[PDB]
Design a protein around this ligand. Structure first.
Ligand SMILES: O=P(O)(O)C(O)(Cc1cnc2ccccn12)P(=O)(O)O
Ligand SMILES: O=P(O)(O)C(O)(Cc1cnc2ccccn12)P(=O)(O)O
Ligand SMILES: [Mg+2]
Ligand SMILES: [Mg+2]
Ligand SMILES: [Mg+2]
Ligand SMILES: [Mg+2]
Ligand SMILES: [Mg+2]
Ligand SMILES: [Mg+2]
Lengths: 337, 337
């Protein structure tokens, strides 16, 4: 229901790029186009697609005219651009090497820290598109405020991520479950699943407070799992599938893995972790990975995935209504594949 | 009329910081407070003050109640935060050393490229304040759109700045007057003088298109001069007054000085510039400065300042009405001091 809506979502990028790219600022426009083409393309588009899919499912098909549907694709593309803005900056700050199957933008010869302003431009495009396509709609300001507030929450999460993961500075006692859950709520949960569903809600005239809170209850939990998965895949994923080289151990991250490791470790295993975590030497990173395997963390992850799936399902049963459960079911099929 | 309104503008920062700083995200809130205190303080506050001053001058004193005035200080503080967000990022990208009399935030031990997310947070605070204080006002959306569009224009200017000034890559023929004027229009003119005056207009219910275009005609020119001055002061200013070490020559910038140099230089002077521009060696930078002095660029700047002042004055006579000319006069007194 996604799979049979992509290529058309993806096909529309060319039109997104064309309107954003319409004499003195020509060189700047040409660089924006480069930035958009390198950084908003090559991922799974599940976040932008979710706006489109949910919009079809929430709006009476008789309001689903040609212009309404165009606004849906645009707002979905807005969500993709929000992602792109954050990832460009996140790769700089995480010292990452590849993303989406190619070198990180900032690693490109001749880009480097210019990418900071490139990221800002991507953000700015969100609001340019919103004005261009949605300014006359009753939900215009709901959407603006949703994107801005989603960004604020994400940056507060990015702040906790980076605080709790200081370079050169082991301190494993920081890395707790309570801490972990807060980081990922803010850095991932809001802008990943709440944002795109909430956007389609607003566009559908569903603006109730209580209805947004109920959608949250499900979507924030989905987002938590998705970040736990992302952390597991950072060490245990195949870079040719994920499209990126993992950095969590060297970056001293409060990864779900290091939290689960800490819950399990013998005092002697503690010392091996502390001696080897947070450092750039492949040797030391390999030692951490072998401790994690010693501790059967891959099996612990597979069990958590099953229990989290059942949990999200429980939550859909409690909280979906009066929204079509398919809204939440489609999404959950996509993330727990 | 500024001078006798500062300390009260400045005094209000403590309240700005307090509301933005009101359990899981505590560490992140504490870091936001640090960021705000380091980066939004220690400048001249002329941009934020202009919102306050212009608001008093445009709004009938009987609408100027306690809440209206509080909104004015807040929106002025919004303009200061926009500045702060841009400068934090600009210092990274310009490889700068000091700002406002202290080391650049990103140069702080233990900050570094975390400052990218700190800058984003500063941006986000703009819109948090707008919601907190202005959400019920008829000009709420005018203001949001003004700040967002001001940011977009500034980032397009930052894009031209950085394109035209590539590291390691002399090409002096890029550095033209036409090019220069476009860079500075976008990177400085909009968010420096148009923004704060326009904000006070909107808050005063002055939302006419034509009235905003007329205010622009004056304010965009003021902003151009202000950037020409900034460039002159980069090489010829006293760092204990400006509060910052200059980087333009080493950063290979399309500075007004290098443009004026190029207009004047003997073919042999051309080669000295080309041989020495855009490089980190103090020796080579000193050679550029001595060419500029050879060419009497300080005298050329002083003459341009006088002619630009007379021009802006001409423009105030043409375009101020029906706004109080004092709006524009106060500002011009402050910048051509
Ligand atoms: O690098 P990835 O792709 O593994 C990563 O997942 C990227 C990520 C997660 N949440 C955010 C929020 C803002 C910017 C990037 N974000 P992580 O959090 O692990 O850096
Ligand atoms: O570093 P300064 O203070 O000399 C500088 O004037 C800073 C500056 C001017 N215009 C902008 C726009 C966005 C961010 C910074 N901006 P410059 O343009 O010369 O970098
Ligand atoms: Mg990260
Ligand atoms: Mg990352
Ligand atoms: Mg990751
Ligand atoms: Mg600059
Ligand atoms: Mg600079
Ligand atoms: Mg400068």
């Amino acid at each position: 229901v996604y799979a049979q809506e992509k290529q058309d979502f993806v096909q529309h990028f060319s039109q997104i790029v064309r309107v954003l790219t319409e004499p003195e600022i020509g060189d700047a426009i040409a660089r924006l186009k480069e930035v958009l083409e390198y950084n908003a393309i090559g991922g799974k588009y599940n976040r932008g697609l979710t706006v489109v899919v949910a919009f079809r499912e929430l709006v009476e098909p008789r309001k689903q005219d040609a212009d309404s549907l165009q606004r849906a694709w645009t707002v979905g593309w807005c969500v993709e651009l929000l992602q792109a803005f954050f990832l460009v900056a996140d790769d700089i700050m995480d010292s990452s090497l590849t993303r989406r199957g190619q070198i990180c933008w900032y690693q490109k010869p001749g880009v480097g820290l210019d990418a900071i302003n490139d990221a800002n431009l991507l953000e700015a495009c969100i609001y340019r598109l919103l004005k261009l396509y949605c300014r006359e709609q009753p939900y215009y300001l709901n959407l603006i405020e949703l994107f801005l507030q989603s960004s604020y929450q994400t940056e507060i999460g990015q702040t906790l991520d980076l605080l709790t993961a200081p370079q050169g500075n082991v301190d494993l006692v920081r890395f707790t479950e309570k801490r972990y859950k807060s980081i990922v709520k803010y850095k991932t949960a809001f802008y990943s699943f709440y944002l795109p569903i909430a956007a389609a809600m607003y566009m559908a005239g569903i603006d109730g407070e209580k209805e947004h809170a109920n959608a949250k209850k499900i979507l924030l939990e989905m987002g938590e799992f998705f970040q736990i998965q992302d952390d597991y895949l950072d060490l245990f994923g195949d870079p040719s599938v994920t499209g990126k080289i993992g950095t969590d151990i060297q970056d001293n991250k409060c990864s779900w893995l290091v939290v689960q490791c800490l819950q399990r470790a013998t005092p002697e295993q503690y010392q091996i972790l502390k001696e080897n975590y947070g450092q750039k030497e492949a040797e030391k990173v390999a030692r951490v990975k072998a401790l994690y395997e010693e501790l059967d963390l891959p099996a612990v992850f597979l069990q958590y995935e099953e229990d989290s799936y059942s949990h999200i399902m429980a939550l859909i049963e409690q909280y979906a209504a009066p929204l079509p459960p398919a809204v939440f079911l489609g999404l959950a099929r996509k993330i727990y594949k």
